[PDB]
Amino acid sequence: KIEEGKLVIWINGDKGYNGLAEVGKKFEKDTGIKVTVEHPDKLEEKFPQVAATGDGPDIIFWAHDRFGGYAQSGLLAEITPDKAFQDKLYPFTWDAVRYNGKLIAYPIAVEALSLIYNKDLLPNPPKTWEEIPALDKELKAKGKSALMFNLQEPYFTWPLIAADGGYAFKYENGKYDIKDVGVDNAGAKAGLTFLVDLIKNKHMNADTDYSIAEAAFNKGETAMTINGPWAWSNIDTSKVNYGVTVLPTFKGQPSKPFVGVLSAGINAASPNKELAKEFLENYLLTDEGLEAVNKDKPLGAVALKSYEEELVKDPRIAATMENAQKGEIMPNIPQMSAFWYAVRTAVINAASGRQTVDEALKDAQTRIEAAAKEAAAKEAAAKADTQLFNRAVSMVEKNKDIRSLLQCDDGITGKERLKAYGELITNDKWTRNRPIVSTKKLDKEGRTHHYMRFHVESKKKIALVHLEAKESKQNYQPDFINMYVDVPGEKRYYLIKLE
């Protein structure tokens, strides 16, 4: 599995991994602990496959939004920074790395869309979306436009749509409410309507996508575009005299771009959790640490206050951090896929006049709520089944007779650690080759029974445990009414035998 006594770190090949490697060598110099940095191809796909077997890196670096899913699968450890350390990062970044209310990664860098403008077409950019029409009209006579950006992808149009009160999923008390979706409220309707009216009034074109906006800006045809730090390179080569600044407000409210937080999580299967904490808190998240990474490849804006204040000597970075501080942290739940698809259709439909704004957003709202509802139900069922499993596993593994049937090696170093896991089945969508699930049926009195089966394994036996639980009517928590264990070569053992 994961080598104890050393650190293996996974980070994407587009980050400053050589800078990170140098931080590791300083860690090694000081502590004697070796740090190995790798940047495997498709690491965000590999990590869940590998960490589910107990393998993988000790530390994984990736955008925060994938981590919620990782945490659901039980792949990430809860981290434990003290308040003193948390105080060293911008408060808003900690809201990006929570699951079930708990902290599950360290924020490293921060990324958001900004307004990018051409200084030779627009020496002072507008601070307000409401300013853009009059501005475009004056620019049009000069044969140029005010603004072109990607309208095909809701990531780019969201900042305006969310400004007056739209939101993806509501975040409250350190968690998301996936059934609370803010796509069809007055605020989202107002923002999209404004966008639609920019198009109706010929100030923008519905067809405009990423490459069209990029080439339009970098050839001086339009005064402004909306884009992120990844685009700055191509602008430099274009030799446009450009500036990067705060996104325009709408109805007095800041635009709310989605914020992405590069984060470092700790593999729940790692035996080096304390070493990882030391490395991340005391070596990487320092001015010296981030600077080493940043010199290899720019991190952009960072979560660490002391170093971000150094970096803002590049005004483009100060603009990124400003938009991120006013933006919407991208929710770290898997259901964002439903959000992306539904809102993409809504915006395309509204922008091209295929549907009214109100109809478009209402359909989007309904599609997301349907997806959230099914997910929430599956989530509640799995959580309930997991509870049955946990109670059942404790009863089996503590039973002296069953341990004897299992021929447990309960010798001089104590009780054998038994393993429990679900039956192996054909894997499809959401895989899980071994889900812990129960089948359900109603009895004559309308009460649901749950039927579950799972394995308990010692070195000498793999046993099958069968249970039947009957839901109360009630004082919470279902009662087990039948539970037995079939150990190969042995007579069935009844923990509870239904009469």
Side-chain angles (χ1 to χ4, degrees):
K1 306 201 257 199
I2 295 137
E3 194 155 321
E4 107 104 68
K6 54 117 53 195
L7 284 179
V8 173
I9 298 178
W10 282 9
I11 188 166
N12 208 47
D14 63 345
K15 308 296 179 184
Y17 54 84
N18 283 328
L20 185 59
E22 291 149 23
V23 182
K25 308 307 288 184
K26 169 55 134 52
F27 189 71
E28 180 177 351
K29 178 207 176 279
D30 292 355
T31 73
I33 305 285
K34 187 196 202 174
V35 186
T36 300
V37 178
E38 295 165 344
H39 46 99
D41 189 48
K42 313 316 297 178
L43 72 91
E44 77 284 13
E45 293 190 26
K46 285 181 188 158
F47 178 76
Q49 297 280 280
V50 72
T53 84
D55 273 19
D58 294 274
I59 301 171
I60 173 83
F61 283 74
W62 200 260
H64 75 287
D65 57 90
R66 287 299 300 272
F67 283 1
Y70 290 166
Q72 289 180 332
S73 300
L75 306 170
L76 289 181
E78 181 170 19
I79 64 169
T80 62
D82 66 357
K83 189 47 171 39
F85 179 88
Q86 298 172 38
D87 286 345
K88 295 180 169 176
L89 307 202
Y90 293 108
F92 84 97
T93 66
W94 292 110
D95 297 325
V97 287
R98 297 191 183 268
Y99 179 77
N100 221 131
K102 304 174 148 57
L103 295 177
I104 49 73
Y106 291 84
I108 304 295
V110 173
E111 178 174 71
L113 288 170
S114 293
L115 183 64
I116 300 157
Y117 67 105
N118 185 335
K119 296 179 179 162
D120 300 316
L121 279 50
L122 198 56
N124 73 315
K127 290 295 151 205
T128 251
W129 275 102
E130 287 88 351
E131 263 153 5
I132 292 176
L135 192 60
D136 181 68
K137 199 208 155 196
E138 280 128 51
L139 285 169
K140 281 290 164 50
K142 306 179 61 178
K144 297 188 185 297
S145 65
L147 170 75
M148 298 192 56
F149 67 105
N150 182 8
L151 305 186
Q152 304 309 300
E153 213 46 55
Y155 177 88
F156 293 84
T157 51
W158 193 247
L160 170 59
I161 297 168
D164 196 40
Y167 56 90
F169 304 94
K170 190 62 188 201
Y171 184 75
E172 302 174 276
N173 305 319
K175 35 191 141 187
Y176 286 105
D177 185 351
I178 76 288
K179 290 178 288 196
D180 189 343
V181 176
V183 156
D184 84 331
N185 62 30
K189 287 183 195 308
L192 187 52
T193 290
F194 190 78
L195 183 58
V196 167
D197 293 348
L198 282 177
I199 295 155
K200 283 174 185 290
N201 292 339
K202 304 283 199 311
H203 299 309
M204 298 200 316
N205 309 296
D207 280 328
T208 303
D209 67 352
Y210 192 90
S211 53
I212 292 176
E214 186 174 44
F217 186 75
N218 302 8
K219 290 155 35 182
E221 319 192 328
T222 187
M224 296 172 290
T225 181
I226 291 179
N227 220 330
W230 55 87
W232 300 347
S233 287
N234 298 348
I235 313 172
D236 296 338
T237 88
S238 85
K239 300 299 183 250
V240 162
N241 187 20
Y242 75 102
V244 181
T245 191
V246 55
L247 293 158
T249 63
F250 171 67
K251 288 160 133 286
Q253 310 305 311
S255 281
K256 294 200 65 183
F258 279 117
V259 186
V261 180
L262 173 68
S263 298
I266 297 173
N267 187 329
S270 185
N272 304 297
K273 293 189 190 58
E274 216 69 34
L275 289 181
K277 169 184 191 161
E278 183 176 352
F279 176 79
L280 294 170
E281 289 186 13
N282 308 145
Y283 284 78
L284 179 64
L285 285 163
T286 63
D287 296 330
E288 292 68 33
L290 300 184
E291 181 178 59
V293 176
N294 192 73
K295 288 176 166 178
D296 187 20
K297 286 171 208 173
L299 285 160
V302 303
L304 181 65
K305 301 166 178 177
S306 61
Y307 190 59
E308 167 69 7
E309 287 168 9
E310 297 196 7
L311 290 174
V312 298
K313 74 180 186 309
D314 184 345
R316 304 171 308 167
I317 298 180
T320 296
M321 175 60 86
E322 177 162 7
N323 292 309
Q325 285 181 322
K326 295 157 175 178
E328 176 173 356
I329 293 172
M330 188 175 306
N332 67 344
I333 59 209
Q335 291 61 51
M336 274 298 291
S337 72
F339 174 92
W340 294 122
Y341 286 121
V343 180
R344 175 183 301 113
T345 295
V347 184
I348 297 303
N349 285 354
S352 63
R354 195 158 180 258
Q355 270 188 304
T356 58
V357 164
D358 289 11
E359 261 232 331
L361 287 179
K362 197 233 188 314
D363 280 4
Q365 176 81 18
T366 306
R367 290 198 257 254
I368 305 166
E369 289 171 358
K373 180 177 50 244
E374 185 193 4
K378 296 187 122 37
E379 198 177 79
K383 182 207 244 292
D385 280 335
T386 288
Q387 275 309 317
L388 296 187
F389 179 72
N390 292 343
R391 299 170 50 200
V393 168
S394 68
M395 293 172 194
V396 172
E397 298 189 354
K398 291 171 186 162
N399 182 292
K400 160 262 219 308
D401 299 325
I402 287 162
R403 294 192 68 90
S404 174
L405 292 183
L406 287 175
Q407 297 177 25
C408 283
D409 181 15
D410 296 339
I412 71 163
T413 59
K415 283 163 50 185
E416 181 179 342
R417 196 181 322 251
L418 296 175
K419 305 187 214 308
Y421 49 85
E423 297 190 287
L424 184 52
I425 60 190
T426 302
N427 50 264
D428 290 283
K429 59 284 106 37
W430 211 76
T431 40
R432 283 214 87 185
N433 57 341
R434 300 181 174 275
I436 308 287
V437 275
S438 65
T439 60
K440 244 168 40 201
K441 42 194 66 184
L442 263 35
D443 65 10
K444 280 153 294 304
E445 311 162 29
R447 278 185 290 231
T448 163
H449 295 202
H450 297 266
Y451 301 76
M452 175 173 290
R453 169 171 49 245
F454 63 87
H455 288 111
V456 172
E457 161 190 325
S458 69
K459 281 180 292 184
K460 307 262 191 56
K461 296 289 173 170
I462 306 183
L464 196 53
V465 179
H466 289 79
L467 67 93
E468 179 179 353
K470 176 159 156 179
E471 294 239 32
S472 272
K473 268 326 297 116
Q474 66 180 70
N475 65 313
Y476 33 87
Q477 211 209 52
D479 301 316
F480 290 122
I481 63 174
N482 203 42
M483 185 176 183
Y484 62 85
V485 185
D486 283 327
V487 181
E490 303 296 334
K491 279 154 53 167
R492 178 172 299 190
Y493 182 92
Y494 284 95
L495 280 161
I496 306 178
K497 178 161 179 58
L498 185 54
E499 194 196 353

